[PDB]
Write a protein that binds this ligand. Structure first.
Ligand SMILES: C[C@@H]1O[C@@H](Oc2ccc([N+](=O)[O-])cc2)[C@@H](O)[C@H](O)[C@@H]1O
Length: 437
């Protein structure tokens, strides 16, 4: 195999208690909040279809003019405690927060740039307030951090000269300064989730991504670091040139979850999917009619899908410029929350069950060999087919919400019909299996 100084560090899955916690959490929320919430995808009376947090790009807005949006940053309805309560009611165990998105505006009063919350009418340390409020509810906080920074002239998209190399070096020192600052100001952070690391400039500096991961693990014991940060000696990203995952989990699947039949390889490493409610809006966008908006069951389906394949799922929110959430997002949080309250035993601290996928829905495995059937598609046959692996027998089936016994009929070796419940639950539901050796 290829000689590497900056390839994969972990052999298989980390199993220290912090990584176990990161994994067992399973369901998180994402917060994309930045200057982009003010225009909300509209620039000079025109609504753009592109992702709102990218509006500076779509509308060709110079750095100086975009960043003047700071003068309007005054989220008067913001209440960190109420944000924390919303997250708790939704059943999220963690929240990932945009500390600085591509635009380069910091949600914490960084010492290293003037483009921060400190220099707006609101003045207050938003990041600090959220970290405390979430933590007070027993919710872990993860930091989103964009390496790419449209506010800083030293950023480069590629290195094709000594000049680029010198500027980028300065940029990387500035970046390191911000990272160490976050890590030491907010020592309860559990994860750094890097974004804007896809450029050729970053690929040519694999050494730096490995140093950034080491630097943070040294500052925050047990911290998690995503694969999206990492490039190796050859510029190959996420997985090194020997095929081994870099960082602590694979971060991806924003557009496409792993196929439950063809993508079983993913069960071999920790991973996390983040998802938007509309097709592709992360930051606040004023017009959600421009693309398909996922219903609660469609989101729940994805959450279970991820867990059923040994992955976490994170649901994105784009708070309004006033510091409140749109009613579509409040409804989603509440609907997920109701369902999680009923059926979350099949999600929290669950993993890949090792069973062949069936059409009615998903399996998840509890930590102590509970096998949960999560039914999204109710069979007219009134029979849920279960094909067990070699050695496995189904001893009992129980409806999760009521404890009622569910009929199990053996149909052939390694195959059973689990009866649907006597009364249709009328929403996606869970049947718990007692299995044996
Ligand atoms: C979470 C998102 O991350 C990136 O956009 C991406 C990056 C990767 C994928 N992806 O590989 O599916 C999709 C959107 C960002 O540019 C962005 O605006 C948002 O923060």
């Amino acid at each position: 195999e290829i000689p590497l100084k900056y390839g994969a560090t972990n052999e298989g899955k980390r199993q220290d208690p912090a990584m176990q916690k990161f994994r067992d959490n399973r369901l998180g929320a994402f917060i994309h909040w930045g200057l982009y919430a003010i225009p909300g995808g509209e620039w000079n009376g025109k609504v753009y279809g592109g992702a709102a947090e990218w509006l500076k790009s779509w509308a060709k807005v110079p750095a100086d003019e975009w960043l003047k949006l700071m003068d309007q940053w005054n989220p008067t309805k913001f209440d960190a405690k109420k944000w924390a309560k919303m997250a708790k009611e939704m059943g999220t165990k963690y929240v990932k927060i945009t500390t600085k998105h591509h635009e380069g505006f910091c949600l914490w009063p960084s010492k290293y740039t003037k483009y921060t919350v400190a220099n707006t009418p609101y003045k207050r340390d938003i990041l600090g307030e959220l970290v405390k409020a979430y933590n007070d509810e027993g919710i872990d906080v993860h930091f989103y951090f964009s390496v790419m920074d449209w506010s800083n002239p030293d950023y480069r998209y590629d290195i094709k000269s000594k000049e680029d190399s010198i500027a980028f070096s300065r940029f990387l020192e500035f970046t390191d300064n911000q990272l160490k600052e976050l890590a030491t100001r907010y020592p309860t952070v559990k994860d750094f989730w890097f974004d804007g690391t896809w450029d050729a400039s970053v690929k040519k500096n694999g050494w730096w991504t490995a140093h950034a991961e080491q630097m943070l693990k040294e500052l925050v014991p047990g911290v998690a670091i995503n694969s999206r940060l990492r490039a190796d000696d050859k510029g190959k990203r996420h997985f090194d040139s020997n095929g081994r995952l870099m960082g602590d989990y694979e971060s991806g699947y924003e557009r496409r979850l792993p196929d439950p039949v063809k993508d079983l390889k993913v069960t071999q490493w920790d991973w996390e999917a983040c998802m938007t409610i509309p097709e592709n809006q992360w930051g606040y966008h004023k017009d959600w009619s421009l693309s398909y908006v996922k219903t609660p069951i469609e989101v729940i389906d994805r959450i279970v899908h991820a867990v059923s394949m040994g992955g976490n799922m994170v649901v994105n929110f784009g708070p309004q410029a006033d510091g409140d959430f749109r009613p579509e997002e409040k409804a989603m949080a509440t609907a997920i929350g109701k369902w999680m309250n009923r059926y979350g035993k099949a999600v929290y601290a669950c993993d890949y069950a090792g069973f062949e996928k069936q059409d009615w829905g998903y399996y998840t495995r509890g930590k102590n060999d509970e096998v949960y059937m999560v039914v999204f598609n109710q069979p007219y046959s009134e029979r849920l087919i279960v094909k067990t692996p070699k050695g496995i027998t189904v001893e009992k089936a129980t409806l999760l919400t009521t404890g009622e016994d569910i009929t199990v009929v053996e149909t052939t070796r390694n195959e059973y019909n689990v009866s649907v419940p006597k009364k249709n639950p009328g929403e996606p539901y869970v049947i718990q299996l007692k299995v044996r050796a």
